Amino acid sequence: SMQEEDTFRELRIFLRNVTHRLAIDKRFRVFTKPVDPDEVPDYRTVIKEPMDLSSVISKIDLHKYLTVKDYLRDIDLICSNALEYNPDRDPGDRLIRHRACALRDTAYAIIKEELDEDFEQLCEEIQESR
Ligand SMILES: CC(=O)N1C[C@@H]2C[C@@H]3O[C@]2(Cc2[nH]cnc23)C1
């Protein structure tokens, strides 16, 4: 229905605003673009599904996310990729792990405060019906 397409357009507006607020935070700069194959030629042999905040905005605009749950699966993949690729005790690895955990926790906290649980349940019920 037209009302259902208005629901999904409100979901996209909401996801673009959360994603912009993560992308401007100086802590999260390392997550704003794909890892450069040139600088790190080993990255794509270890990490089988790379993800970054620029790809997330592209995916919103391609209508890839019909629920906030499917968006959070990509935020979780950015964070789990960084924990798996940078697991060592040295300060460089520990700093990127601390930033990855802060990106995940910040996204979840904005969604807990600003997403209406009945808006998310409506998106889930339209998705299930298709
Ligand atoms: C997001 C992530 O997990 N990354 C690991 C890489 C290792 C290190 O920070 C890089 C990018 C880079 N270029 C040169 N050294 C590096 C980003």
- Residue 22 Cα, ligand 1 centroid: separation in angstroms? 18
If we measure between CA atoms, which residue out of 106, 98, 115 comes closest to residue 25? 106
Method used to determine the 3D structure? X-ray
Please state, in angstroms and rounded to a whole number, the distance separating the CA atoms of residues 82 and 93: 9
Contacts of 97 (CB under 8 A, 6+ apart): 82, 83, 86, 87
CATH class of 1-130: mainly alpha
Which atom of ligand 1 approaches the CA of 81 most closely?
A: 3
Resolution in A: 1.7
100 within 8 A of 83, measured Cβ to Cβ:
yes
If we measure between CA atoms, which residue out of 22, 18, 20 comes closest to residue 79? 22
- Residue 51 Cα, ligand 1 centroid: separation in angstroms? 13
103 within 8 A of 75, measured Cβ to Cβ:
yes
**Cα 20 from chain centroid?**
11
81 within 8 A of 50, measured Cβ to Cβ:
yes
